[PDB]
Amino acid sequence: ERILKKQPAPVRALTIHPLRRYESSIYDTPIPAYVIKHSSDGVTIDIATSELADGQSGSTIQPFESVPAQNLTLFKHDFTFGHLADTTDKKFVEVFGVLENRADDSDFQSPDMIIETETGHVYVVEFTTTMGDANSADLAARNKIAKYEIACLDRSAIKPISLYIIAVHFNGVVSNLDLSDEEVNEIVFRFRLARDIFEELRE
Ligand SMILES: [Mn+3]
């Protein structure tokens, strides 16, 4: 019997912490070799994680990956963020139910994460990437906020919601989470490696 579920109600409202610019501080760090091979559905990838130093950016990377042909278009986004959450089609409706009598489009939106805690807060987290610079990243982040703000606002009447964004570019992250340098480095490092792999995969 979980006692945190027995607290007085929290304020039902949408919270958005301000976005911040972070920059990677990677420098000369080995980038693992990868071997791409044709497979039955798509490609197999073999990442030489042995080449990485202990305590260096990239320690979250797994040596082996299967990418089916239907998943190559999402590979960059999903690989980049694969240490924080696995791919999902978990919709708003699974967590809040339909909002007024009738189901609508915002019920079937699927942000990258929807976390609900015992205390009754809900956290919506969305990841994204850009091939441009930090300004591109800031803009990408604002577009994800615009994509999901309405659905979050209406449902915050049911449980309070905090909306978070992580937007990666080649040299940093725009995010309203409070990230360490290692955490920024890991995201960027995984993004840079995903870019290299993706250019050979589209080919
Ligand atoms: Mn995303």
Residue numbers in the entry: 2 to 204
Please share text taken word for word from the publication where this structure appeared.
Here, we carried out a structural and functional characterization of the TOSV cap-snatching endonuclease, an N terminal domain of the viral polymerase (L protein) that provides capped 3′OH primers for transcription. We report TOSV endonuclease crystal structures in the apo form, in complex with a di-ketoacid inhibitor (DPBA) and in an intermediate state of inhibitor release, showing details on substrate binding and active site dynamics. The structure has significant rearrangements in the domain folding compared to previously reported EN structures. To better illustrate these changes, we show the structure in comparison with the EN domain of the homologous LACV, the prototype of the Orthobunyavirus genus, in Figure 2B and C. The TOSV EN fold is organised as two alpha-beta lobes rather than the one alpha/beta and one alpha bundle lobe architecture that is conserved in LACV EN and all previously described bunyaviral cap-snatching EN structures. The active site of the TOSV EN is defined by the H-D-PD-E-K motif, and maintains the canonical configuration observed in other His+ cap-snatching ENs.
Crystals of the apo form grew as small bars in the presence of 2 mM MnCl2 that diffracted to 2.4 Å. In the apo crystal asymmetric unit, each molecule incorporates one Mn2+ ion (Mn1) in the active site with real space correlation coefficients (RSCC) of 1. The Mn2+ ions are octahedrally coordinated by the sidechains of D113 on βa, H78 on αb, E127 on βb and the main chain carboxyl of F128 on βb, together with two water molecules, all at distances of 2.2 Å. D90, residing in the flexible loop between αb and αc, is displaced from the manganese coordination site and shows high B-factors (above 94 Å2) compared to the low B-factors (<40 Å2) shown by the other highly ordered catalytic residues. The electron density for the entire flexible loop and in particular for D90 is weak but unambiguous for the main chain. K145 is located in helix αd, and forms one hydrogen bond to the water molecule that coordinates the manganese ion. The apo structure also contains seven sulphate ions bound to molA and three to molB in the asu with RSCC above 0.83. Four sulphate ions are found close to the active site. Since there are no cap-snatching EN structures in complex with RNA substrate available in the PDB, we explored the possibility that some of these sulphate ions could mimic the path of the TOSV EN RNA substrate binding. Finally, a fourth sulphate ion (SO4′), outside of the proposed RNA binding path, forms a hydrogen bond with K145 amino moiety. The amino acid sidechains involved in hydrogen bonds with these sulphate ions are conserved among Phenuiviridae ENs, with the sole exception of T131, further supporting that these sulphate ions are located in an RNA binding site (see alignment in Supplementary Figure S5).
